[PDB]
From Swiss-Prot:
Portion of the parent chain present: 76 to 208 of 366
Role according to the record: Unknown. Affects both sporulation and germination.
Species of origin: Bacillus subtilis (strain 168)
Record protein name field: Spore germination protein GerM
Length: 133
């Protein structure tokens, strides 16, 4: 296994970094996002009191560009979150991706559509989400 940060939601509802041991992978950014999905492989290794963040059955493609941007393009299930978790989800995805050496910012898509706003509640989002946010 390899130590990775997963930005999970704790017993008090906060998005908090947790270090988990993930199997070795040739697509580590995608893998880390797969370990944020409710009901996915993180389920067996969640630390006490923590939960996963992305809706069940969400899948994703991560395309890492030469400028440091990771384009994370989610399946339609990604729309199935609770409104009030909208910004926590953006933060979790952003912080989880930007741990990697080749990613310093994030752009979100759903079903290959570019996102100006998150779908459930309309939170505006830029194409250069980063830890500065
Ligand atoms: Na905590
Ligand atoms: Na809270
Ligand atoms: Na890994
Ligand atoms: Na592997
Ligand atoms: Na693996
Ligand atoms: Na990789
Ligand atoms: Na907790
Ligand atoms: Na779910
Ligand atoms: Na890069
Ligand atoms: Na509401
Ligand atoms: Na980085």
């Amino acid at each position: 296994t390899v130590m990775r940060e997963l930005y999970l939601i704790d017993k008090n509802g906060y998005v908090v970094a947790q270090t988990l041991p993930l199997p070795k992978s040739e697509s580590t950014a995608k893998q880390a996002l797969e370990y944020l999905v409710q009901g996915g492989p993180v389920s067996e290794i969640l630390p006490n009191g923590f939960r996963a963040v992305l809706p069940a059955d969400t899948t994703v493609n991560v395309d890492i560009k030469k400028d440091g941007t990771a384009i994370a393009d989610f399946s339609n299930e990604f729309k199935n979150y609770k409104k009030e978790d909208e910004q926590k989800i953006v933060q979790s995805v952003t912080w989880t991706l930007t741990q990697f050496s080749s990613i310093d910012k994030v752009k979100l898509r759903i079903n290959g559509h570019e996102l100006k706003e998150m779908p459930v509640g309309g939170t505006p989002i830029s194409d250069d989400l980063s830890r500065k946010d």
